Each structure stands twice: as structure tokens, then as C-alpha cells.
Coordinates of C-alpha atoms in Angstrom, one line a residue:
Chain A
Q3 CA 0.0 0.0 0.0
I4 CA 3.1 2.2 0.0
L5 CA 3.5 4.4 -3.0
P6 CA 6.6 6.4 -3.8
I7 CA 4.5 9.1 -5.5
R8 CA 1.2 10.9 -4.7
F9 CA -1.7 11.6 -7.0
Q10 CA -4.0 14.5 -7.1
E11 CA -6.9 15.5 -9.3
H12 CA -7.0 19.3 -9.0
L13 CA -10.0 20.1 -11.1
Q14 CA -12.2 18.8 -13.9
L15 CA -12.6 21.2 -16.8
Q16 CA -16.1 20.0 -17.7
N17 CA -17.3 21.3 -14.4
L18 CA -16.4 24.8 -15.7
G19 CA -18.5 24.3 -18.8
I20 CA -15.6 23.7 -21.2
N21 CA -16.7 21.7 -24.2
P22 CA -14.3 18.8 -24.8
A23 CA -13.8 19.6 -28.5
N24 CA -11.7 22.6 -27.4
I25 CA -9.8 20.5 -24.9
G26 CA -6.9 19.7 -27.2
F27 CA -3.3 20.8 -28.1
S28 CA -4.5 23.5 -30.5
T29 CA -6.9 25.3 -28.1
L30 CA -5.7 24.7 -24.5
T31 CA -2.5 26.0 -23.1
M32 CA -0.9 25.6 -19.7
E33 CA 2.5 27.3 -19.5
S34 CA 2.7 26.8 -15.7
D35 CA 0.7 25.4 -12.9
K36 CA -1.0 28.8 -12.1
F37 CA -3.2 29.3 -15.2
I38 CA -5.0 27.4 -18.0
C39 CA -6.3 29.3 -21.1
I40 CA -8.8 27.8 -23.5
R41 CA -9.9 29.4 -26.8
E42 CA -13.6 28.8 -27.6
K43 CA -16.3 29.8 -30.1
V44 CA -19.4 31.1 -28.4
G45 CA -21.3 32.7 -31.2
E46 CA -19.0 33.5 -34.1
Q47 CA -16.5 35.8 -32.4
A48 CA -13.9 33.9 -30.4
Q49 CA -13.5 33.9 -26.6
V50 CA -10.7 33.0 -24.2
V51 CA -11.5 31.3 -20.9
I52 CA -8.9 32.0 -18.3
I53 CA -8.9 29.7 -15.2
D54 CA -7.0 30.8 -12.1
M55 CA -5.7 27.7 -10.5
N56 CA -6.0 29.3 -7.0
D57 CA -9.7 30.2 -7.6
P58 CA -10.8 27.5 -10.0
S59 CA -14.6 28.0 -9.5
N60 CA -14.6 31.6 -10.9
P61 CA -13.2 31.7 -14.5
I62 CA -13.3 34.8 -16.6
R63 CA -14.3 35.0 -20.3
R64 CA -13.0 37.7 -22.6
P65 CA -13.7 38.0 -26.4
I66 CA -10.6 37.6 -28.5
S67 CA -9.5 37.8 -32.2
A68 CA -6.4 35.6 -31.9
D69 CA -5.4 32.1 -33.0
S70 CA -3.4 31.3 -29.9
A71 CA -3.2 32.5 -26.3
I72 CA -0.5 31.8 -23.8
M73 CA -0.4 33.1 -20.2
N74 CA 2.9 34.1 -18.6
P75 CA 4.1 31.4 -16.2
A76 CA 4.1 33.8 -13.1
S77 CA 1.7 36.8 -13.7
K78 CA -1.7 37.4 -15.2
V79 CA -0.1 38.5 -18.5
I80 CA -1.4 37.1 -21.7
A81 CA 0.4 36.8 -25.0
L82 CA -1.9 36.6 -28.0
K83 CA -1.1 36.3 -31.7
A84 CA -3.1 36.5 -35.0
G85 CA -0.8 35.2 -37.7
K86 CA 2.1 37.6 -37.8
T87 CA 0.7 40.2 -35.4
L88 CA 1.9 39.5 -31.9
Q89 CA 0.7 41.2 -28.7
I90 CA 1.2 41.0 -25.0
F91 CA -1.4 42.3 -22.6
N92 CA -1.7 42.9 -18.8
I93 CA -5.2 41.5 -17.9
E94 CA -6.0 43.0 -14.6
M95 CA -4.5 46.5 -15.4
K96 CA -6.0 46.3 -18.9
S97 CA -2.7 47.5 -20.3
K98 CA -0.9 46.6 -23.5
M99 CA 2.6 45.6 -22.8
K100 CA 4.3 45.2 -26.2
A101 CA 3.6 44.3 -29.9
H102 CA 5.4 43.2 -33.0
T103 CA 4.4 42.2 -36.5
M104 CA 6.6 39.4 -38.1
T105 CA 7.3 38.6 -41.7
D106 CA 6.6 34.9 -41.5
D107 CA 3.6 33.6 -39.6
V108 CA 4.3 32.2 -36.1
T109 CA 3.0 28.6 -36.1
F110 CA 4.1 27.7 -32.6
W111 CA 5.1 29.7 -29.5
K112 CA 5.8 29.2 -25.8
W113 CA 7.1 31.1 -22.8
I114 CA 10.6 29.8 -22.0
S115 CA 11.2 32.3 -19.2
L116 CA 9.4 35.0 -17.2
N117 CA 10.4 37.5 -19.9
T118 CA 10.8 35.5 -23.1
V119 CA 8.4 34.0 -25.5
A120 CA 10.1 31.8 -28.1
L121 CA 8.6 32.1 -31.5
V122 CA 8.7 29.4 -34.2
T123 CA 7.9 30.1 -37.8
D124 CA 8.1 27.7 -40.8
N125 CA 11.9 28.0 -41.1
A126 CA 13.4 29.8 -38.1
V127 CA 13.2 30.1 -34.3
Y128 CA 13.1 33.5 -32.7
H129 CA 13.3 34.7 -29.0
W130 CA 11.0 37.7 -28.2
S131 CA 12.0 39.2 -24.9
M132 CA 9.7 41.5 -22.9
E133 CA 12.4 43.7 -21.4
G134 CA 14.4 44.0 -24.6
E135 CA 14.7 45.3 -28.1
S136 CA 11.0 44.5 -29.2
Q137 CA 12.4 42.9 -32.3
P138 CA 12.8 39.1 -32.0
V139 CA 16.4 37.9 -32.3
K140 CA 16.9 35.0 -34.7
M141 CA 18.4 32.0 -32.9
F142 CA 18.6 29.4 -35.6
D143 CA 17.1 28.2 -38.9
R144 CA 14.9 25.1 -38.9
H145 CA 16.4 21.8 -40.2
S146 CA 14.9 20.0 -43.2
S147 CA 14.1 17.0 -40.9
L148 CA 11.5 19.0 -39.0
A149 CA 9.7 20.1 -42.2
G150 CA 6.1 19.2 -42.5
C151 CA 6.0 18.3 -38.8
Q152 CA 3.5 19.3 -36.2
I153 CA 5.7 21.4 -33.8
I154 CA 4.9 20.2 -30.2
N155 CA 7.5 21.6 -27.9
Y156 CA 10.4 24.0 -27.5
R157 CA 12.7 24.0 -24.5
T158 CA 16.0 25.6 -23.5
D159 CA 18.7 25.0 -20.9
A160 CA 18.8 27.4 -18.0
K161 CA 21.2 30.0 -19.5
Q162 CA 19.6 29.7 -23.0
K163 CA 22.8 28.4 -24.7
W164 CA 21.2 25.0 -25.6
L165 CA 18.0 25.1 -27.5
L166 CA 15.7 22.3 -28.7
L167 CA 12.7 22.2 -31.0
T168 CA 10.5 19.1 -31.2
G169 CA 8.1 18.0 -34.0
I170 CA 6.3 14.8 -34.8
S171 CA 5.0 13.3 -38.1
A172 CA 3.6 10.0 -39.4
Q173 CA 6.2 7.8 -41.2
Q174 CA 5.5 4.1 -41.9
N175 CA 2.5 3.9 -39.6
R176 CA 4.4 5.3 -36.6
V177 CA 4.6 8.7 -34.9
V178 CA 8.2 9.6 -35.5
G179 CA 9.6 12.5 -33.5
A180 CA 12.2 14.8 -35.0
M181 CA 14.2 17.1 -32.8
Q182 CA 16.7 19.8 -33.6
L183 CA 19.2 20.5 -30.7
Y184 CA 21.0 23.8 -31.3
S185 CA 24.1 25.1 -29.5
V186 CA 24.3 28.9 -29.5
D187 CA 28.1 29.0 -28.9
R188 CA 29.2 26.9 -31.8
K189 CA 26.2 27.7 -34.0
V190 CA 25.5 24.1 -35.1
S191 CA 22.4 22.0 -34.9
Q192 CA 22.0 18.2 -34.6
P193 CA 19.0 16.4 -36.0
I194 CA 17.9 13.9 -33.3
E195 CA 15.0 11.4 -33.3
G196 CA 13.2 12.1 -30.0
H197 CA 9.7 12.4 -28.6
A198 CA 9.9 14.2 -25.3
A199 CA 12.7 16.2 -23.7
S200 CA 13.8 18.6 -20.9
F201 CA 17.0 20.2 -19.7
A202 CA 18.1 20.0 -16.1
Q203 CA 20.8 21.3 -13.7
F204 CA 22.4 18.6 -11.6
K205 CA 25.2 18.9 -9.0
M206 CA 27.4 15.9 -8.8
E207 CA 28.9 14.8 -5.5
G208 CA 32.5 15.9 -5.4
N209 CA 31.7 18.9 -7.7
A210 CA 31.7 22.6 -6.9
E211 CA 29.5 23.6 -9.8
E212 CA 26.4 22.2 -11.5
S213 CA 26.4 20.3 -14.8
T214 CA 23.9 21.1 -17.5
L215 CA 22.1 17.9 -18.5
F216 CA 20.1 17.2 -21.6
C217 CA 17.5 14.5 -21.1
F218 CA 15.3 13.0 -23.9
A219 CA 13.1 10.0 -24.5
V220 CA 12.4 8.3 -27.8
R221 CA 10.6 5.2 -29.1
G222 CA 12.4 4.3 -32.3
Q223 CA 12.8 1.1 -34.2
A224 CA 15.0 -0.4 -31.4
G225 CA 12.5 0.2 -28.6
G226 CA 12.1 2.9 -26.0
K227 CA 15.2 4.6 -24.7
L228 CA 16.0 7.5 -22.3
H229 CA 19.3 9.3 -22.6
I230 CA 20.8 11.6 -20.0
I231 CA 23.8 13.4 -21.6
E232 CA 25.7 16.4 -20.2
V233 CA 25.9 19.3 -22.7
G234 CA 28.3 22.2 -22.6
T235 CA 31.9 22.3 -21.4
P236 CA 32.3 20.9 -17.9
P237 CA 34.1 23.4 -15.6
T238 CA 37.6 22.5 -14.6
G239 CA 37.5 21.3 -11.0
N240 CA 34.3 19.3 -11.8
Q241 CA 34.2 15.7 -13.0
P242 CA 32.2 15.1 -16.3
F243 CA 28.8 13.5 -16.0
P244 CA 28.9 9.9 -17.1
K245 CA 26.5 9.3 -20.0
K246 CA 23.4 7.3 -19.3
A247 CA 21.1 5.4 -21.7
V248 CA 18.4 3.1 -20.2
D249 CA 15.3 1.5 -21.7
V250 CA 11.8 2.9 -21.6
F251 CA 9.4 0.1 -20.9
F252 CA 6.3 -0.3 -23.0
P253 CA 3.8 -3.2 -22.5
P254 CA 3.1 -5.6 -25.4
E255 CA -0.4 -4.3 -25.9
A256 CA 0.9 -0.7 -26.2
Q257 CA 3.1 -0.8 -29.3
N258 CA 1.3 2.3 -30.6
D259 CA 2.4 4.2 -27.5
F260 CA 5.2 6.8 -27.4
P261 CA 6.5 9.5 -25.0
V262 CA 4.6 12.8 -25.1
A263 CA 5.7 14.8 -22.1
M264 CA 8.7 15.2 -19.8
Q265 CA 9.2 17.4 -16.8
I266 CA 12.2 17.2 -14.5
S267 CA 12.0 17.8 -10.7
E268 CA 15.0 19.9 -9.8
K269 CA 14.6 19.5 -6.0
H270 CA 14.6 15.6 -6.1
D271 CA 16.6 15.0 -9.4
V272 CA 13.8 12.8 -10.8
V273 CA 12.7 12.6 -14.5
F274 CA 8.9 12.4 -15.0
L275 CA 7.9 10.9 -18.4
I276 CA 4.3 10.7 -19.6
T277 CA 3.3 8.5 -22.6
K278 CA 0.4 9.0 -25.1
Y279 CA -1.8 6.3 -23.6
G280 CA -1.5 7.7 -20.1
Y281 CA 1.5 6.0 -18.4
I282 CA 3.8 7.9 -16.0
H283 CA 7.4 6.8 -15.5
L284 CA 9.8 8.0 -12.9
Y285 CA 13.6 7.8 -13.5
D286 CA 16.5 8.9 -11.3
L287 CA 18.4 11.7 -13.1
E288 CA 21.8 10.6 -12.0
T289 CA 21.6 6.8 -12.8
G290 CA 18.5 6.4 -15.0
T291 CA 16.9 3.8 -12.8
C292 CA 13.2 3.4 -13.4
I293 CA 11.7 4.0 -9.9
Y294 CA 8.0 3.7 -10.7
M295 CA 5.5 3.1 -13.5
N296 CA 1.7 3.4 -13.5
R297 CA -1.1 4.4 -16.0
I298 CA -2.5 7.5 -14.4
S299 CA -4.9 8.6 -17.2
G300 CA -7.2 7.1 -19.7
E301 CA -7.0 9.9 -22.2
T302 CA -3.9 11.6 -23.6
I303 CA -2.3 14.1 -21.3
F304 CA -1.3 16.6 -24.0
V305 CA 0.2 19.6 -22.1
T306 CA 2.3 19.5 -19.0
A307 CA 4.0 22.0 -16.7
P308 CA 6.1 21.9 -13.5
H309 CA 4.1 21.8 -10.3
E310 CA 6.2 23.9 -8.1
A311 CA 4.4 23.5 -4.7
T312 CA 5.0 19.7 -4.8
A313 CA 8.1 19.7 -7.2
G314 CA 6.3 17.5 -9.6
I315 CA 4.4 17.4 -12.9
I316 CA 0.9 18.7 -13.6
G317 CA -1.1 18.0 -16.7
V318 CA -4.4 18.2 -18.5
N319 CA -5.9 15.2 -20.5
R320 CA -8.4 15.3 -23.3
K321 CA -11.3 14.5 -20.9
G322 CA -10.4 17.7 -19.0
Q323 CA -8.9 16.4 -15.8
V324 CA -6.1 18.4 -14.2
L325 CA -3.9 15.8 -12.7
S326 CA -0.6 16.0 -10.7
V327 CA 2.0 13.5 -9.8
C328 CA 4.9 14.3 -7.5
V329 CA 7.4 12.4 -5.4
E330 CA 5.9 11.4 -2.0
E331 CA 8.7 12.9 0.2
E332 CA 8.2 10.4 3.1
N333 CA 7.8 7.2 1.0
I334 CA 10.3 7.3 -1.9
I335 CA 13.3 6.0 0.2
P336 CA 11.1 3.4 2.0
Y337 CA 10.0 2.3 -1.5
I338 CA 13.6 1.7 -2.8
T339 CA 14.7 -0.2 0.3
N340 CA 11.9 -2.8 0.4
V341 CA 10.0 -2.9 -2.9
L342 CA 12.8 -2.0 -5.4
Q343 CA 15.7 -3.6 -3.3
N344 CA 18.2 -1.0 -4.4
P345 CA 20.0 0.0 -1.2
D346 CA 22.9 1.8 -2.8
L347 CA 20.6 4.2 -4.6
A348 CA 18.2 4.7 -1.6
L349 CA 20.9 6.2 0.7
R350 CA 22.5 8.1 -2.1
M351 CA 19.0 9.5 -2.5
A352 CA 19.2 10.6 1.1
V353 CA 22.4 12.7 1.2
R354 CA 21.7 15.0 -1.8
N355 CA 17.9 15.4 -1.4
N356 CA 16.3 14.4 2.0
Chain B
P46 CA 19.5 29.8 -45.4
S47 CA 20.6 26.3 -44.5
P48 CA 21.3 25.2 -41.0
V49 CA 24.8 24.0 -40.2
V50 CA 24.5 20.5 -38.9
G51 CA 27.0 18.4 -36.9
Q52 CA 27.5 16.0 -33.9
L53 CA 26.7 17.7 -30.6
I54 CA 26.0 14.7 -28.4
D55 CA 26.9 11.0 -28.8
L56 CA 23.9 8.8 -28.6
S57 CA 25.8 5.5 -28.8
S58 CA 26.4 3.3 -25.8
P59 CA 29.6 1.3 -26.0
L60 CA 29.6 -2.5 -26.5
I61 CA 32.9 -3.0 -24.6
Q62 CA 33.9 -1.7 -21.2
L63 CA 37.5 -0.6 -21.6
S64 CA 37.7 0.9 -18.0

């Protein structure tokens, strides 16, 4: 009866009147655990439905003329775009914050920091800072391998020198993910087959600094795999991070499953991985050991975020459940002693975290 | 404009432990 995680259903979005046809990747955004925005169509003009996660029973509904809407991860500040026209608004103060019109249409965007929305067009990736120039700086041009792909994620490392775009497409009756990992310092990309990814900061024992880790999961033709590779130059005085590559388990009845989401808990150094069919996986960031697996959802959890109050992962499925999984802070070392029988990992979990 | 591509990370795990 001892579980190394803890489960929570925060809210059901059908309780707030959200029709499930607009509960999808194209219409629902969740850039952090504080807000959910949904674009709807009541009448023939559009609406946006903003849900405060600290007051979930009082949503607000404003009319819009935008094709996407993303709330800032920390304030009630909304970014809206209509093709090439981009705008950022303060909701409560009713104040326009900035605006820019592009030359190519922005097909995908996402806040990567408190100040920066990353913009993706059909051939390039831009960073649009709030406190900066008001023109978006071009970061890199998009590789040929990501052409004709549905762009699903963009993530950066903490100091924004390692950038990663992710798209998926259907090749040979399979959802093949194509990633472009870009280094700002050397100005070179690498086309990578991957499905879900995140960067992380990990301090090794015997190290004065942190190492910048790149973590990605993939289901290719050789099965499911999770890689934990250090990117960037290691500082002298620090040992290099030893490269990990472990298997990602899929059951025999789920050969049409693949990873769709990854968040990393920086407090506990734990990789959370969600698959398309609803399975959550927990890996240790240092060794890659699969701690725990369970199917937590019946529908596809299509957008995730960090859940900072519990240092976990929070997500929305297509039914409209807002679900969260985090490490149970009392139970995860009494799970690895008895149920997992890994005593060398369980007390090396204790020094750096507990 | 083409992107310049190369080998940033090694995805291969070695088949021999040379210590």
C-alpha cells in the first residue's frame, strides 16, 4: 500500500463548462501550474477562458481575435497572436505591454522564461524578450528533418545556450519524432529522433558547480530509450557527467504508444515521463533507474508543466482532468529499500535530497 | 538559409567496457 508518488486530481474542466472539442493541443495552453487558457467559439467571435488555479470556480471569459493564447508562467499577463501580429497584454490592469508584426507567420510559440516567448515560424526560431529590443532575435534556422511536422515543444537550458525544437510526423504507420538540438556558442544543430525532452541542472557529489544535462526519451525502431547526456563544457574542478542510456518500458499491448511529455523535478533530481496512452514513468536523473511506473490517465495528457508547490508534474488530459504526480517525500526511500531492493541508490538519494 | 549540422551529443552506448 506504500506508493513512492502521490496523485491529485485538482479540477475537472467539464465542471467549468468547457466543451471537450476545445480540450486539445491546438486550443488549450498551460505554460505553468498557475493558469489554464482555452480558446472557444461562443457565437461567431472567439473567446478565451482564463482559469485561475488558485480560484478554480470563478473563470473569466473575454472575447478575442487571436489564433493562440499563452499566459505568462508567473503573472496574469497574456500573449496573443493573429498570424504575424503578436501582442502581450496585462489582464488586470487592462494594459498593452508590447507588440510586434513578423514577416513569417508564427506557427508555434511558448514562454521559455518569465520575460521571453520563443517564436517558431516555418523556417526559423526567434526569441522575443519582454524587457528587450522589441524585435525578436533570430536564434537558428529550422532543419529539413522537421519540415512538415506538427511542432509540439520547445525547451531551453537554464542559461539559454542550448535550444531544442520538437516536432512529430507519421512515417511508416508510426509517430516519428524529429528534434533539432541547437548550440548557441558553436552555431551548429544536430537532427535527433526524439519524442519528449527537458533540460536539467544537476550537481554531482564531489563537484563545486552544476552540470547542464540534456534528457530526452524516444521510441524508435530499437524500442524505447531514455538518454541523460551532459551538454556544454564541464568546468575544470568538476568531473564530467557519465553518459546514461536506459530502456523505456512499453507493455506488449501498447506498441502504438510513445512518450509525449517530460518534466524534471530539480529538487529531487527525478525525471517524470508521460506516454500518449496515459502512463507515467519515474527515473532517477543521476543513474537512469526506473523507480516507478503506472497508468494514471485514460486519455492523452497533451500539455504539462512543472508543479512547483510539490516539485512534480501537472497536466491536462483530453477529458479535462487536471492531474498531478509528485514524489511522495516520506515514501520514496522506504520504496527503494523494500519494494525495489536498491539499497545503494536509496541512501545516495538521502544525502543529496532528503 | 541552410542550418549547419553536426554532432553535438553522442547517442551511442559502448559495446565494450575498456575501464
